[PDB]
Amino acid sequence: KRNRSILNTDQRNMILEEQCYAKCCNLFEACFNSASYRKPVGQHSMLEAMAHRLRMDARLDYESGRMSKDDFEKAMAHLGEI
Amino acid sequence: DTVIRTHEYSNKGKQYISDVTGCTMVDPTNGPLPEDNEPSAYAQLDCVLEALDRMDEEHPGLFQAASQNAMETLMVTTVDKLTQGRQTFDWTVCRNQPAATALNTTITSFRLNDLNGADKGGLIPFCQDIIDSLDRPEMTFFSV
Amino acid sequence: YSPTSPSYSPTSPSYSP
Amino acid sequence: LSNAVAKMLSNCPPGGISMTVTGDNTKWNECLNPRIFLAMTERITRDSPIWFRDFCSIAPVLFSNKIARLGKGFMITSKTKRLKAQIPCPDLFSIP
Amino acid sequence: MRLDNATWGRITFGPVERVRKRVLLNPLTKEMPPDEASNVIMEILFPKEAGIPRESTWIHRELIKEKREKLKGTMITPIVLAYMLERELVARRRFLPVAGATSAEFIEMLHCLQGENWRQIYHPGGNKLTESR
Amino acid sequence: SMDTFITRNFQTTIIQKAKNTMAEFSEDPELQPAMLFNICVHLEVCYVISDMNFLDEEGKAYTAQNLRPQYEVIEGMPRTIAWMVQRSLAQEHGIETPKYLADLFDYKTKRFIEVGITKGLADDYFWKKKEKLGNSMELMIFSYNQDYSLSNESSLDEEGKGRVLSRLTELQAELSLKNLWQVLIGEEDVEKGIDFKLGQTISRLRDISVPAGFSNFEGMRSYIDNIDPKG
RNA sequence: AAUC
RNA sequence: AGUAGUAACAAGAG
RNA sequence: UAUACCUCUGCUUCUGC
């Protein structure tokens, strides 16, 4: 377990800051599994990477037939907002 | 004790006031040679340069060879190389913190003062930002 | 022979008249 | 060190004496000046380009004008009253 | 398996001159530089991220195919598979004091092989190389 | 100049992606604007091919509703994103990934497309890139003088072929009008010198950070480099 | 008969 | 008191 | 102030190359 002394100090705020980055990184690793193994390279946006991957993944799964017509439009709709 | 003892061995050198910081500075180098066995920071520049010359003579073309290898490595070195360290001093909060955080706090702070050399990926442009950040008239930083 | 026994050691080069 | 010692031993003039000084330097960090370390890089980077010379020159230049933070401070106590209090480093000369 | 099928000789007491040579700690499946192995690992576990296809892919194409089939029906985390592959591809070479045994499958047992003032005969099981013989 | 010219002709989408591509190769957009123009034109040709083209549920070409284009624009996107798309397609359809990077992929053809822009002879520039690829990507080269050299399996429709040649010479006319055509024709190659210069504050610190008997750092630099202390 |  | 030894702990905080 | 015979804490009041 983590040292819990931080809970009583004003440093508390860093706990939220950590768990925020944690979500982002953990979701990035869900899109790019090799990120855990070899350091990802790129000067472009961290969102831009996740967008284009999940776009392709959905398109190929549809044309291959892992993704249905119900799910593909919903997927393209959600990614459309981004 | 260390602060006193450091100046105790350099007290016979040259004392001047830094026009940058406004602090009391002490320079022993090229000072008068010691007349006792007490510790001495009074090292003569020529005697170092001669000993360095003697090394280049005994080991031919090692300096330019070593410089090349380091210089070529610097180009390849990423910014994340500063994450693999121990407890580092964080200027923003003025307390020691992990290197990985102490780096992140500086990158986020530099983005406000408009220094995005870190984003390029290389350590060279990030180092170029650090020496430039001294020139900024005011340095803003987040304080939750 | 057991390693602790003196007879375990090899028949070494001995000198003769 | 074994090979170094073997050579430094077996190279010595015959019918002489080879002596080993089991040595150590006191006040190592307290004496060595950054301005000497600056001179060292300038000599080592003589052939290398001008951008790299200036790069290697910074680290020593920073150490040459470095500032020391004096830790927490000093704790003062009345034994009779049975009280204590830390005196921050900026308030060192606040007390006679 | 090497310790299991191995046979042990006899312990001899007497002086052993030991040399400090740079030896391979663990036997590899097929040796590669760090860069070449890293790409082979990528082709097996993370095909799409891999990136610019080097010739190294075509050289070790037979290994990649074989590893994929062996690591097919497993629930274990990729990061573990990558680590375990990296072991049996990247070289672990470091200086050790040795005496008449430099082969990895000996170096892994170097603690039981000999000391300063004693020696022990040990036949490691499995297979040995022709080059090494 | 070429700098102000590109602002009027192209949109921000083509300008940004062009600069972002050059940024990865460590090439300055402003100091070499003719090199940016080569990519700007190269991306605009690729963009228009996939713009009006779309697919349906049955899976045949049509003009326009739908959320699945017929062509996949690889050129313009970053390296690590491009090679992700490159391999994902090749692995899915079940074909060998090409040795070098591609520009477009046609879902109806199931083959990679290599786009190329050239100054003079278009047929000459076609056979040069055929040496490297051979039978990897279906090449589609175009030039400014209304001279085209398409692939054997011509998937490009007649109406679409006109839109390409229309925009090609229209830009070539605009360049010749403002006397900016002479900039692109001329050769452009300069060394990317590694720039690291010290500012005002850090230089002031280095000046005082010198031994006794030195005015400033310049004195310390020259001394160590020139004089010989032996003895 | 080594280098990695 | 005691631990300890060039300065602390012998509880801290809301 | 009061809740507080309550609540939280045990390396996170500075551990470098």
mmCIF file of N, CA, C and O in Angstrom, chain B residues 65-112:
data_model
loop_
_atom_site.group_PDB
_atom_site.id
_atom_site.type_symbol
_atom_site.label_atom_id
_atom_site.label_comp_id
_atom_site.label_asym_id
_atom_site.label_seq_id
_atom_site.Cartn_x
_atom_site.Cartn_y
_atom_site.Cartn_z
ATOM 1 N N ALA B 65 38.040 12.164 -29.827
ATOM 2 C CA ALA B 65 37.367 10.852 -29.988
ATOM 3 C C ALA B 65 36.244 10.712 -28.953
ATOM 4 O O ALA B 65 35.128 10.309 -29.337
ATOM 5 N N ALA B 66 36.538 11.030 -27.687
ATOM 6 C CA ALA B 66 35.585 10.994 -26.552
ATOM 7 C C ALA B 66 34.504 12.064 -26.750
ATOM 8 O O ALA B 66 33.324 11.759 -26.483
ATOM 9 N N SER B 67 34.895 13.264 -27.196
ATOM 10 C CA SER B 67 33.985 14.409 -27.476
ATOM 11 C C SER B 67 32.951 14.007 -28.534
ATOM 12 O O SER B 67 31.745 14.252 -28.310
ATOM 13 N N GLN B 68 33.413 13.406 -29.636
ATOM 14 C CA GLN B 68 32.568 12.896 -30.751
ATOM 15 C C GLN B 68 31.491 11.957 -30.195
ATOM 16 O O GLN B 68 30.298 12.234 -30.418
ATOM 17 N N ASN B 69 31.908 10.896 -29.493
ATOM 18 C CA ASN B 69 31.020 9.828 -28.957
ATOM 19 C C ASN B 69 29.922 10.453 -28.087
ATOM 20 O O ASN B 69 28.751 10.067 -28.255
ATOM 21 N N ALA B 70 30.294 11.383 -27.199
ATOM 22 C CA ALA B 70 29.382 12.108 -26.281
ATOM 23 C C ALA B 70 28.435 13.002 -27.089
ATOM 24 O O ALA B 70 27.207 12.915 -26.873
ATOM 25 N N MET B 71 28.995 13.824 -27.984
ATOM 26 C CA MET B 71 28.247 14.780 -28.848
ATOM 27 C C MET B 71 27.194 14.027 -29.671
ATOM 28 O O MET B 71 26.041 14.498 -29.722
ATOM 29 N N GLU B 72 27.583 12.908 -30.292
ATOM 30 C CA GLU B 72 26.694 12.057 -31.131
ATOM 31 C C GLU B 72 25.588 11.451 -30.258
ATOM 32 O O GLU B 72 24.454 11.321 -30.758
ATOM 33 N N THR B 73 25.909 11.100 -29.007
ATOM 34 C CA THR B 73 24.961 10.525 -28.012
ATOM 35 C C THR B 73 23.957 11.605 -27.586
ATOM 36 O O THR B 73 22.749 11.291 -27.524
ATOM 37 N N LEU B 74 24.442 12.821 -27.311
ATOM 38 C CA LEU B 74 23.609 13.985 -26.903
ATOM 39 C C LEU B 74 22.464 14.177 -27.906
ATOM 40 O O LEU B 74 21.320 14.376 -27.454
ATOM 41 N N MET B 75 22.765 14.122 -29.209
ATOM 42 C CA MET B 75 21.773 14.279 -30.310
ATOM 43 C C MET B 75 20.662 13.231 -30.166
ATOM 44 O O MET B 75 19.485 13.599 -30.343
ATOM 45 N N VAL B 76 21.022 11.982 -29.853
ATOM 46 C CA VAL B 76 20.081 10.822 -29.770
ATOM 47 C C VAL B 76 19.337 10.856 -28.426
ATOM 48 O O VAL B 76 18.194 10.356 -28.381
ATOM 49 N N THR B 77 19.953 11.417 -27.378
ATOM 50 C CA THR B 77 19.396 11.490 -25.997
ATOM 51 C C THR B 77 18.029 12.188 -26.017
ATOM 52 O O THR B 77 17.960 13.335 -26.505
ATOM 53 N N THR B 78 16.993 11.520 -25.495
ATOM 54 C CA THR B 78 15.609 12.050 -25.345
ATOM 55 C C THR B 78 15.503 12.832 -24.029
ATOM 56 O O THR B 78 16.441 12.740 -23.216
ATOM 57 N N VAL B 79 14.401 13.563 -23.830
ATOM 58 C CA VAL B 79 14.140 14.394 -22.613
ATOM 59 C C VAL B 79 13.857 13.469 -21.423
ATOM 60 O O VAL B 79 14.235 13.837 -20.292
ATOM 61 N N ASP B 80 13.229 12.314 -21.675
ATOM 62 C CA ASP B 80 12.803 11.330 -20.642
ATOM 63 C C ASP B 80 14.026 10.710 -19.946
ATOM 64 O O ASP B 80 13.826 10.014 -18.931
ATOM 65 N N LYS B 81 15.239 10.950 -20.457
ATOM 66 C CA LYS B 81 16.519 10.515 -19.829
ATOM 67 C C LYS B 81 16.679 11.167 -18.447
ATOM 68 O O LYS B 81 17.430 10.610 -17.625
ATOM 69 N N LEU B 82 16.002 12.296 -18.203
ATOM 70 C CA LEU B 82 16.040 13.040 -16.913
ATOM 71 C C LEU B 82 15.031 12.460 -15.911
ATOM 72 O O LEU B 82 14.992 12.970 -14.776
ATOM 73 N N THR B 83 14.254 11.440 -16.298
ATOM 74 C CA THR B 83 13.270 10.759 -15.411
ATOM 75 C C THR B 83 14.009 9.741 -14.539
ATOM 76 O O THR B 83 13.689 9.656 -13.339
ATOM 77 N N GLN B 84 14.952 8.999 -15.130
ATOM 78 C CA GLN B 84 15.786 7.984 -14.427
ATOM 79 C C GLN B 84 16.810 8.710 -13.540
ATOM 80 O O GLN B 84 17.998 8.775 -13.909
ATOM 81 N N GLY B 85 16.341 9.234 -12.405
ATOM 82 C CA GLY B 85 17.160 9.872 -11.357
ATOM 83 C C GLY B 85 16.547 9.647 -9.986
ATOM 84 O O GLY B 85 15.451 9.055 -9.921
ATOM 85 N N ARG B 86 17.226 10.098 -8.928
ATOM 86 C CA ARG B 86 16.742 10.014 -7.523
ATOM 87 C C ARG B 86 16.043 11.333 -7.169
ATOM 88 O O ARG B 86 15.869 12.169 -8.079
ATOM 89 N N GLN B 87 15.645 11.500 -5.902
ATOM 90 C CA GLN B 87 15.013 12.738 -5.371
ATOM 91 C C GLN B 87 15.760 13.953 -5.936
ATOM 92 O O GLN B 87 16.971 14.062 -5.682
ATOM 93 N N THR B 88 15.058 14.802 -6.694
ATOM 94 C CA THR B 88 15.578 16.031 -7.356
ATOM 95 C C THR B 88 14.916 17.263 -6.729
ATOM 96 O O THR B 88 13.733 17.167 -6.349
ATOM 97 N N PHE B 89 15.650 18.376 -6.639
ATOM 98 C CA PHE B 89 15.145 19.684 -6.145
ATOM 99 C C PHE B 89 14.209 20.288 -7.198
ATOM 100 O O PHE B 89 14.648 20.471 -8.352
ATOM 101 N N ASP B 90 12.961 20.576 -6.808
ATOM 102 C CA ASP B 90 11.917 21.186 -7.675
ATOM 103 C C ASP B 90 11.787 22.670 -7.308
ATOM 104 O O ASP B 90 11.250 22.971 -6.223
ATOM 105 N N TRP B 91 12.273 23.550 -8.189
ATOM 106 C CA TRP B 91 12.349 25.026 -7.998
ATOM 107 C C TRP B 91 10.953 25.626 -7.775
ATOM 108 O O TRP B 91 10.863 26.641 -7.058
ATOM 109 N N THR B 92 9.911 25.027 -8.365
ATOM 110 C CA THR B 92 8.508 25.524 -8.330
ATOM 111 C C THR B 92 7.988 25.531 -6.886
ATOM 112 O O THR B 92 7.526 26.598 -6.435
ATOM 113 N N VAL B 93 8.066 24.388 -6.197
ATOM 114 C CA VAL B 93 7.524 24.184 -4.818
ATOM 115 C C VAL B 93 8.643 24.362 -3.779
ATOM 116 O O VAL B 93 8.309 24.468 -2.582
ATOM 117 N N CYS B 94 9.909 24.391 -4.216
ATOM 118 C CA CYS B 94 11.129 24.553 -3.372
ATOM 119 C C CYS B 94 11.226 23.414 -2.347
ATOM 120 O O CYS B 94 11.549 23.690 -1.175
ATOM 121 N N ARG B 95 10.956 22.180 -2.787
ATOM 122 C CA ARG B 95 11.114 20.930 -1.997
ATOM 123 C C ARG B 95 11.645 19.832 -2.925
ATOM 124 O O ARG B 95 11.373 19.906 -4.138
ATOM 125 N N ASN B 96 12.365 18.851 -2.377
ATOM 126 C CA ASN B 96 12.831 17.659 -3.134
ATOM 127 C C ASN B 96 11.605 16.826 -3.528
ATOM 128 O O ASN B 96 10.694 16.684 -2.688
ATOM 129 N N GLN B 97 11.581 16.324 -4.767
ATOM 130 C CA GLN B 97 10.527 15.419 -5.301
ATOM 131 C C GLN B 97 11.161 14.439 -6.283
ATOM 132 O O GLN B 97 12.263 14.679 -6.768
ATOM 133 N N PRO B 98 10.498 13.303 -6.608
ATOM 134 C CA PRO B 98 10.987 12.398 -7.647
ATOM 135 C C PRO B 98 11.308 13.120 -8.967
ATOM 136 O O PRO B 98 10.564 14.018 -9.357
ATOM 137 N N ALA B 99 12.405 12.712 -9.615
ATOM 138 C CA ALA B 99 12.938 13.297 -10.869
ATOM 139 C C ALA B 99 11.832 13.368 -11.931
ATOM 140 O O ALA B 99 11.717 14.418 -12.589
ATOM 141 N N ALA B 100 11.052 12.293 -12.078
ATOM 142 C CA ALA B 100 9.955 12.155 -13.065
ATOM 143 C C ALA B 100 8.915 13.267 -12.867
ATOM 144 O O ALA B 100 8.437 13.806 -13.883
ATOM 145 N N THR B 101 8.579 13.593 -11.613
ATOM 146 C CA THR B 101 7.609 14.665 -11.253
ATOM 147 C C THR B 101 8.304 16.025 -11.401
ATOM 148 O O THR B 101 7.747 16.902 -12.105
ATOM 149 N N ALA B 102 9.483 16.176 -10.782
ATOM 150 C CA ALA B 102 10.306 17.411 -10.797
ATOM 151 C C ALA B 102 10.527 17.882 -12.241
ATOM 152 O O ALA B 102 10.581 19.109 -12.459
ATOM 153 N N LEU B 103 10.655 16.940 -13.182
ATOM 154 C CA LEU B 103 10.755 17.208 -14.643
ATOM 155 C C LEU B 103 9.404 17.711 -15.161
ATOM 156 O O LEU B 103 9.388 18.748 -15.853
ATOM 157 N N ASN B 104 8.321 16.992 -14.845
ATOM 158 C CA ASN B 104 6.948 17.276 -15.345
ATOM 159 C C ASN B 104 6.526 18.682 -14.905
ATOM 160 O O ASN B 104 5.979 19.419 -15.751
ATOM 161 N N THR B 105 6.781 19.038 -13.641
ATOM 162 C CA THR B 105 6.426 20.357 -13.041
ATOM 163 C C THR B 105 7.136 21.491 -13.793
ATOM 164 O O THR B 105 6.525 22.567 -13.942
ATOM 165 N N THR B 106 8.372 21.257 -14.247
ATOM 166 C CA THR B 106 9.204 22.233 -15.002
ATOM 167 C C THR B 106 8.663 22.389 -16.430
ATOM 168 O O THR B 106 8.583 23.541 -16.898
ATOM 169 N N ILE B 107 8.324 21.279 -17.094
ATOM 170 C CA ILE B 107 7.773 21.263 -18.485
ATOM 171 C C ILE B 107 6.455 22.049 -18.507
ATOM 172 O O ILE B 107 6.306 22.916 -19.394
ATOM 173 N N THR B 108 5.547 21.765 -17.563
ATOM 174 C CA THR B 108 4.211 22.416 -17.435
ATOM 175 C C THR B 108 4.381 23.906 -17.109
ATOM 176 O O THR B 108 3.566 24.707 -17.606
ATOM 177 N N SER B 109 5.388 24.253 -16.302
ATOM 178 C CA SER B 109 5.716 25.646 -15.898
ATOM 179 C C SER B 109 6.317 26.414 -17.083
ATOM 180 O O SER B 109 5.977 27.600 -17.245
ATOM 181 N N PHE B 110 7.181 25.761 -17.869
ATOM 182 C CA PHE B 110 7.876 26.333 -19.057
ATOM 183 C C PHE B 110 6.859 26.643 -20.166
ATOM 184 O O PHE B 110 7.062 27.633 -20.906
ATOM 185 N N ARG B 111 5.809 25.821 -20.278
ATOM 186 C CA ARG B 111 4.704 25.986 -21.265
ATOM 187 C C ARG B 111 3.971 27.313 -21.019
ATOM 188 O O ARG B 111 3.513 27.915 -22.009
ATOM 189 N N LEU B 112 3.868 27.751 -19.759
ATOM 190 C CA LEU B 112 3.195 29.024 -19.375
ATOM 191 C C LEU B 112 4.074 30.212 -19.783
ATOM 192 O O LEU B 112 3.525 31.186 -20.331
#
